[PDB]
Design a protein around this ligand. Structure first.
Ligand SMILES: *C(=O)[C@@H]([C@@H]1NC(C(=O)O)=C(S[C@@H]2CN[C@H](C(=O)N(C)C)C2)[C@@H]1C)[C@@H](C)O
Ligand SMILES: [Co+2]
Ligand SMILES: [Co+2]
Length: 448
């Protein structure tokens, strides 16, 4: 009497299959969910329950689309639609493997990475270490990552947030890349004292150098020119504190204190990336706005759905959001090249030279942010999120990469330190090579 719907499949942007169903026998007939990639993108895809309905991930959140509706006799069975993701399995597989061995090498508790298409904001890879395998029983995998931290688990971004300040001073005409500043080693601001990560007297950093060397004092001086209201406004335009709408269950909104509630010291913290939280996707989404000539396209991971007859409906495109002008966005991309610039004499070296890839105009930003000690309700001294976000490339934006490491003891490649810059190098360089992308004067970070 019952006519069963056949579960639809989940495929990547090139119709490469991630999840699909085969017919078997046991209550006699029995559908078997196949995951040919094992753990590949399982943070996104999810897994099935014993009854063949989704248990978690997109298998669950899109279950209605994928399961269809059983028929009877007459009511015709509505077979499940196939879901096409924006993911590129080749990119996802490379990125997911690099994330796992950045975790092993660095000693971090967890690692995640997001790659967005620069122009559309489509999610090309989203990965975390320790990803579970939905072809095996989930009750055997308590030691595994079953979820999707890149959207669910916010963190404080540290100096990667300084893209907001850079964008605001350039957009409002308050400074220019070549302005020579005078940056003391510390200032008193809103009742507190902010210090640069290195002791120094007054340095003649250019505005480019303030972000290239990640000077907190320089960042806050420039942020004083912007003001709290224009700064908070730019935070919101970059999409912070708000869900992206990417189409994945468990998305966190992060946390941005609304301006009417700031304490006297909020403005001394937010511009350098403390006192607010965001997900890795929001973080990467900020750099996508600058990559896309100032126009933020909220990221999306559903590309389309295919009906059982074979007809294809594209997912509707989210509306653009103008954050800064194209001229401003191009200026910020060029400035962020200083972060990855090498200088043997040290003077004109950024904080992330290992993130540079010779022959390409890589641009990016390093971050280190203290975490909150759960017992004192205060910051740890020596527990950090490490972050990096960057654009490949400044002159031709194609890819946007965001990375977070939860408290590594070493670099992402295993050398002493605690930088994610080498992970960006690996991924960004590989994206250029695999597409045979073809290959000016040094930037001035520090004047005389
Ligand atoms: C931003 O994350 C903080 C400052 N900017 C940077 C930076 O982007 O590199 C740092 S961390 C810098 C690099 N590694 C040095 C170090 O002493 N360690 C190995 C821990 C210092 C600044 C702290 C901003 C939030 O203060
Ligand atoms: Co009827
Ligand atoms: Co290399």
């Amino acid at each position: 009497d019952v006519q069963p719907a056949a579960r639809g499949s989940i495929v990547d942007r090139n119709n490469d299959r991630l999840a699909f169903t085969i017919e078997a026998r046991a209550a006699e007939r029995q559908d078997l969910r196949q995951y040919p990639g094992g753990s590949l993108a399982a943070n996104v895809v999810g897994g099935i329950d014993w009854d063949g309905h989704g248990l978690l991930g997109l298998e669950d959140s899109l279950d209605a689309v994928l399961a269809g509706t059983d028929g009877s006799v007459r009511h015709k069975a509505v077979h499940g639609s196939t879901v096409v993701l924006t993911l590129d399995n080749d990119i996802q597989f490379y990125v997911q493997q690099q994330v796992q061995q950045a975790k092993n090498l660095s000693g971090a508790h967890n690692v995640s990475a997001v790659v967005l298409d620069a122009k559309t904001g489509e999610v090309l890879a989203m990965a975390n270490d320790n990803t579970f395998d939905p072809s095996q029983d989930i009750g055997r995998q308590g030691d595994k990552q079953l979820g999707n931290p890149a959207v669910s688990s916010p963190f404080e971004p540290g100096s990667v947030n300084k893209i907001v300040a850079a964008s605001a001073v350039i957009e409002h005409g308050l400074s220019s890349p070549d302005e020579v500043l005078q940056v003391p080693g510390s200032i008193q601001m809103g009742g507190v004292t902010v210090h640069d990560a290195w002791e120094h007297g007054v340095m003649p950093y250019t505005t480019t150098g303030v972000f290239g060397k990640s000077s907190n004092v320089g960042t806050l001086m420039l942020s004083q020119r912007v003001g709290p209201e224009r700064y908070y406004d730019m935070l919101r335009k970059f999409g912070l504190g708000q869900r992206t709408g990417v189409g994945l269950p468990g998305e966190s909104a992060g946390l941005v204190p609304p301006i009417d509630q700031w304490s006297g010291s909020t403005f001394a913290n937010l511009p350098i990336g403390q006192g607010l939280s965001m997900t890795l996707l929001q973080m990467t989404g900020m750099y996508q706005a600058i990559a896309n000539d100032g126009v933020r396209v909220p990221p999306r991971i559903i590309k389309a759905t295919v009906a059982p007859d074979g007809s294809r409906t594209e997912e509707p495109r989210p509306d653009d959001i103008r954050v800064v002008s194209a001229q401003t966005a191009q200026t910020v991309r060029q400035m962020l090249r200083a972060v990855v610039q090498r200088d043997p004499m040290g003077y004109q070296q950024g904080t992330g030279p290992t993130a540079g890839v010779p022959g390409y105009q890589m641009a990016g930003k390093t971050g280190t942010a203290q975490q909150i000690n759960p017992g004192c309700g205060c910051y740890f001294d020596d527990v950090y999120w490490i972050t990096f976000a960057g654009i490949a490339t400044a002159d031709n934006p194609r890819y946007v990469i965001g990375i977070m490491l939860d408290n590594p003891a070493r670099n992402s490649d295993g050398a002493p330190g605690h930088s994610a810059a080498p992970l960006f190098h690996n991924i960004a360089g590989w994206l250029m090579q695999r597409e045979n992308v073809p290959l000016g004067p040094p930037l001035v970070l520090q004047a005389t």
